[PDB]
Design a protein around this ligand. Structure first.
Ligand SMILES: CO[C@@](NC(=O)[C@H](C(=O)O)c1ccc(O)cc1)(C(=O)O)[C@@H]1NC(C(=O)O)=C(CSc2nnnn2C)CO1
Ligand SMILES: CO[C@@](NC(=O)[C@H](C(=O)O)c1ccc(O)cc1)(C(=O)O)[C@@H]1NC(C(=O)O)=C(CSc2nnnn2C)CO1
Ligand SMILES: CO[C@@](NC(=O)[C@H](C(=O)O)c1ccc(O)cc1)(C(=O)O)[C@@H]1NC(C(=O)O)=C(CSc2nnnn2C)CO1
Ligand SMILES: CO[C@@](NC(=O)[C@H](C(=O)O)c1ccc(O)cc1)(C(=O)O)[C@@H]1NC(C(=O)O)=C(CSc2nnnn2C)CO1
Ligand SMILES: [Zn+2]
Ligand SMILES: [Zn+2]
Ligand SMILES: [Zn+2]
Ligand SMILES: [Zn+2]
Ligand SMILES: [Zn+2]
Ligand SMILES: [Zn+2]
Ligand SMILES: [Zn+2]
Ligand SMILES: [Zn+2]
Lengths: 264, 264, 264, 264
């Protein structure tokens, strides 16, 4: 009767199904997979990447960046929604091969430094290669690259450093306010009386209000289905996409239902 | 045709077979498994741990420490042979639950900081929870805990920070010089013209001479079979144990055979 | 006309005036200087240090710990109010010479990692030896050492990771709720429209309410004069000491006065 | 009688005397001060910086980079001789304002992480803002940027991670092998029986032989006077410049003289 073997982080096959760059606005592109969002913004002074998905997506992201005419050293910045394995996986590998810098809040930085290990809810079950944060950003701080300003909005809940990024692009000259909000889910989390996260409910509730107030005309999420995006249908991907209110209102109802069943 | 799934680091079942503390000398104890060495030294001022094996061995090591009458906060120091997954696995978890400090050279420290990721030979295939080094030690530096002096001897080869630790204990009053030398193997390594390790052959050859010169009366290795230790037979474990010369002489012959076949 | 020379962080002479351990409660002791608070709590399972002052106070703190009958390896934990040079200075040196662990929130951890450099308000003017955080604590998390429970209360303002620690001791059997609240000052800070800290006013105001609500019978601050403590008079030190309300009410009035004059 | 005040790292005024870019070869430029070497190499794919001097030289280096027609985001790499305050000072500030990556060996990386604190010989007397190493390089590893290959040669002595960088440039079409060797001095070091550096003499002696064997036609050093460079005379700067043999032969004679007087 020996000690058990290590277990690998296995996900759905749709999370790893590669797709070609699907255009969102004049400057924003989806270069991830069908069920994992990885946003690429092209400016005149370089490129900015928002999330990257699973650790084995590094080569696929570089192929799509080459498809958009972007060299590795043209990726100037890497922004994260939250530092979990299915979103900040290839960050370490992408920093070594692109010469890019990662900006994240202090809570996302410390979790990125230990590669998702010692997670508040998952422990060491979802460990990915660790990376370091080059620039610590605060709540409401503006990050400007090539004229495009990225505003951070702290929405702690899924992780203590969960962050929503808001910027303004164009839809053929016509401006558009895009909001890439992080997840509001608590899969298997202990909400009531968690010794590792005592103020979790206060952070989740306040984050529900933060998402509703974001300046947004088109919403995206790290998991496209959570905001009713269908990356696999191309042009009609944003057809049934939700609003900030509907996304936060739906996520809050299932949080209170989960909170209610947890008390029983 | 999606991207492949992550693969877990699977080892032989004998590496995870727990055993009770097997006494080596008056103060040194083997508290690991049958095929993974984890040494515990008990002093009057606390305990010192040398290696820990696989990441899922943390609880087993604490159980054997409790069996020897050692509290978690009595573990003062954690010494490493080299920072690979099958030897420094539970180091991060053991630091959180014991209040111990880790001493290692700069090369072992940087590899421990990124949890075995970006390995020179294995890449990201063997990633374990990352840990930090509290004290950077140099070649030949003496680390003293409770009167027992631990002398470090840099033997780079398997890893750039591979280290052999030498201390003197007692066999019922009679002193004994114990040498815990690291591995001299290169499993699947590219020896000739490795762009990640140009001076690898020079480091391996010089490390072969360093092991032969160690002051030793009883030799141990992170893998007991590499020094002909048989932990599963109790008292007769050190029966056929090798010497420093025989251990370095045998490891060098298979290095030159591997070097010869690699050129062809 | 060459570039200017480096300038050292000089403080008032009263900040560096050493004093003997002044007893606060049955287990809490003041072992710092006359104008810099460094609290020592003695339990049956080890000692806990709260702040340490200037970097050159490391030897003085160890002398007072020896005066209280505490060995270096008996210091189990180091807690911080905020990671500035005049409070977390000797933390790096104290970790090397005591075998202690440092617990701090993510914001205090990242500032401690870069040794106070790249400060939001002071830049690189107040740099001290860097240290690492061993345990990341969340808001409201309980840290227990030897039965004495330390509850953290995030009060961001002076620094993004400013923290107040609350524990219950005894005054000769009679229990007492002691609250070690951090500073609420903003010396020379830009409050309105600070690009490095956009939500500073919201954090300061909410921290004013957090201090008023702390369970406290005896209040202490990193600077004793800020809470009307007079360490230099021994027994009568806590004579004119303020309450949580009076301390937060006074600090808020001068914040609004500073905010008013800044707008003009 | 209070504790002493902190002391700032003061240097000679000639170390901080700014100068204009002085051309060395077709691609290598000196953009530091009169007595502190900071080399800039311009390629078609970006720029590479070798050392930077004192921490307050960051703005001056960027001004000279702008003088050479190099944008901040065009600085791709920062290479270090050794991680002391008078050579890796502005590295942290230059990483934040240029988007560059730092490559260094493990020993230079760990010393850069703690900002020169806990020095083997100087303690905490020369602390500078800490920085992180993005890429760990090994002995003899080739670092290529824009076609120009930089070969690292470990020469431990002044610091455990002292490194000499060798690359080949052109003198108007005519190739030239430039070697930027680190210092071989031991100012006030304890050579014989240093508990923090037991194998120091073995490292110094072997580094003396490593410098003599470097492929070099024009030698430079972090301190120009150490290799008989006179940056203040423009074209005649390399007039009396030494060779690799003469530089290592002279440094070894004063090492043995220092070693001889230390024994007495
Ligand atoms: C770590 O990745 C998530 N969990 C898992 O993959 C697995 C699990 O928890 O069942 C383990 C997670 O974050 O919880 C992922 N992410 C999200 C999300 O981001 O909302 C949702 C929804 C759950 O699946
Ligand atoms: C990482 O662990 C080792 N390798 C493996 O477990 C697997 C492999 O390489 O086949 C992967 C390794 O270090 O190479 C282990 N360790 C030793 C050793 O320590 O000598 C020997 C011999 C090989 O097995
Ligand atoms: C960094 O130390 C403080 N500032 C200084 O020492 C100097 C300055 O700012 O004038 C520089 C600071 O934190 O602002 C110290 N600390 C506190 C405090 O902790 O409230 C008060 C009040 C100001 O003096
Ligand atoms: C830290 O900077 C050096 N020392 C000092 O500036 C001062 C000192 O040591 O006297 C302190 C040093 O490295 O020793 C500098 N650097 C070199 C060198 O690089 O060789 C030589 C020669 C001494 O001066
Ligand atoms: Zn997640
Ligand atoms: Zn997810
Ligand atoms: Zn190994
Ligand atoms: Zn192994
Ligand atoms: Zn302060
Ligand atoms: Zn202060
Ligand atoms: Zn130096
Ligand atoms: Zn120098």
């Amino acid at each position: 009767a020996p000690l058990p073997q290590l277990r690998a982080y296995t996900v759905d096959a749709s999370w790893l199904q590669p797709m070609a760059p699907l255009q969102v606005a004049d400057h924003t592109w989806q270069i991830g997979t069908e069920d994992l969002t990885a946003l690429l913004v092209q400016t005149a002074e370089g490129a900015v990447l928002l999330d990257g998905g699973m650790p084995q997506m590094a080569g696929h992201l570089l192929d799509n960046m080459k498809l958009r005419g972007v060299a590795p050293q043209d990726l100037r910045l890497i922004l994260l929604s939250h530092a979990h394995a299915d979103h900040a996986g290839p960050v370490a590998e992408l920093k070594r091969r692109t010469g890019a810098h990662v900006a994240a809040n202090a809570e996302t930085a410390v979790l990125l430094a230990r590669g998702g290990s010692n997670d508040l809810h998952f422990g060491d079950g979802i460990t990915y290669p660790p990376a370091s944060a080059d620039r610590i950003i605060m709540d409401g701080e503006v990050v400007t690259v090539g004229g495009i300003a990225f505003t951070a909005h702290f929405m702690p809940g899924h992780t203590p450093g969960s962050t929503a990024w808001t910027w303004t692009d164009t839809r053929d000259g016509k401006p558009v306010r895009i909001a890439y909000a992080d997840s509001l889910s608590a899969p298997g989390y202990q909400l009531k009386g968690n010794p590792r996260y005592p103020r979790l409910i206060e952070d989740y509730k306040r984050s529900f209000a933060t998402v509703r107030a974001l300046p947004c005309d088109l919403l995206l999420t790290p998991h496209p289905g959570a905001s009713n995006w269908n990356y696999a249908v191309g042009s009609k991907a944003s057809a049934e996409a939700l609003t900030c209110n509907a996304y936060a209102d739906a996520a809050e109802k299932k949080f209170d239902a989960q909170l209610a069943r947890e008390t029983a």
